[PDB]
Amino acid sequence: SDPSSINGGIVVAMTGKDCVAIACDLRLGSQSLGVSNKFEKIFHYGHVFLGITGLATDVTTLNEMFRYKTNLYKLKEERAIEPETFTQLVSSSLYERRFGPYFVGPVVAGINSKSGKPFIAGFDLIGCIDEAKDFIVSGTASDQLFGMCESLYEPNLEPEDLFETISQALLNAADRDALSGWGAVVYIIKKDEVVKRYLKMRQD
């Protein structure tokens, strides 16, 4: 009866030296029952990455929606949408459903391909933008993620260091939440290569 914690799951994002990382768990459940171990919560539209936590049906719907909107954007503008811009489009789209919202906690990460700047942001279900230098967190284990990140994080990490840090924040937060976990994926994003790593984690 609280739509934001029927299915469970989490997303975290971090900035480093000329890179960003964004990670999620793989659980999809119906309350106590784990149902799927392969439910990824991160999507990309060109070089802009979007993670979505919350009600899975809305997660799926919103991915389908932003694919649609960015495809048309590309056709009309003749370029890939940038993270600063995509962030604004996410905000508009959620607030448009102000009094009947999507029960989601989206997170945007990527590198602006003109300015080279790393960029992350997070949103509430009705579109409020939270831009941050350091990290954004989302999902049923968000308290834990806030704790892990605020203590583990330091500015200007190299991509392979940032990888360890974001992975340890995710894993240890997931393990203190009954509704998150069951696998995990980490995206390391540099100006033009993106590595995707699946983490080994406890399956309970």
């Binding site: 509430d124 009705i126 409020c128 939270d130």
Partner: peptide
């Protein structure tokens, strides 16, 4: 939703 975040308040101020």
């Amino acid at each position: 939703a975040x308040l101020x």
